[PDB]
Amino acid sequence: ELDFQSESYKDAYSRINAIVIEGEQEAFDNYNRLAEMLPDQRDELHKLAKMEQRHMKGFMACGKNLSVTPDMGFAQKFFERLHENFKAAAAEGKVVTCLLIQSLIIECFAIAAYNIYIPVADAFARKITEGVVRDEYLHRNFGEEWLKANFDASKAELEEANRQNLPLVWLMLNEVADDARELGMERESLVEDFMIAYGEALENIGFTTREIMRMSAYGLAAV
Ligand SMILES: CCCCCCCCCCCCCCCCO
């Protein structure tokens, strides 16, 4: 009983949908830079970027389906600080920090958003998103397997990158709140599903329960 036609919904949608398009666009780029920095896995590293471009096109289609023009300007600025950190990190061969930003933080944020979105999405959008989500399950998380295979060498930079970057996702959660509520996506649910995905991700890489509690609390304990 959400009105996908009303002006509130389309308005909030212009920004939310833009965020996802932009996030996919930057994932595409990011996974290309990662293809350079790790030329060795560039094959698998190139397949993911392409996959996100597909996903990006899908969400664009979700936009026209609702006859909504996505505010791509607002979306660019939503990702800017994290995009800056990724760029700077990338410049300096800091591949661990790049993977944490893209493979862990960005992709946990998206998986959380997609699952909250589905049960309240319109028919077309729900289909695309179910597809996107399936694609994410049925492919290895590259950066996560890498970081895991390389944990001891990467542990310290990860903790640092987590301190530099986790708070920015926290800002993004607060910024996206109003509009997401309009779409029927509860803010509490998003924070919850994010932490669950991120915490599990940090476990898989090699962090202990105590380390995971410490690292997860870095955004919210400042708030
Ligand atoms: C039309 C999609 C609805 C879900 C919107 C989620 C609200 C904000 C989260 C955006 C996260 C974008 C990350 C994409 C990265 C891709 O790998």
Q: What gap in Å lies between CA 203 and CA 131, rounded to an integer?
A: 26
Does the beta carbon of 13 sit less than 6 angstroms from any atom of ligand 1?
no
Does the beta carbon of 16 sit less than 6 angstroms from any atom of ligand 1?
yes
Ligand 1 atom nearest to CA at 114: 4
Question: 56 in a domain, yes or no?
Answer: yes
Output b/e per residue, 134-154; b: 16+ Cβ within 10 A. Answer: eebeeeebbbbebbeeeeeeb
Q: Which domain holds residue 184?
A: 6-223
Question: 1 in a domain, yes or no?
Answer: no
CATH number at residue 15: 1.20.1260.10
Residue ranges of alpha helices (H) inside the chain are 7-37, 42-65, 72-91, 95-99, 107-117, 123-137, 142-149, 151-175, 177-182, 187-205, 209-220
* Angle of CA points 65, 69, 70, to nearest 5°: 105
Q: What gap in Å lies between CA 56 and CA 131, rounded to an integer?
A: 12
Please enumerate in sequence order all residues whose Cβ is within 8 A of that of 11, keeping only pairs 6 or more positions apart, or say none. 182
- Residue 147's nearest CA partner among 190, 203, 106 is 203
Entry resolution in angstroms? 2.3
In the chain, the number of structural domains is 1
Given a contact cutoff of 8 angstroms between Cβ atoms, the answer to whether 135 and 55 are in contact is: yes
Q: How many residues does the chain have?
A: 223
Question: 119 in a domain, yes or no?
Answer: yes
Structure tokens at 159: 């903790």
The coordinates were experimentally obtained by: X-ray
**Can you say which residues are annotated as belonging to the binding site for Fe cation?**
24, 52, 55, 107, 139
Q: For residue 59, how many other CB atoms are within 10 A of its CB? A: 22
Q: For residue 131, how many other CB atoms are within 10 A of its CB? A: 13
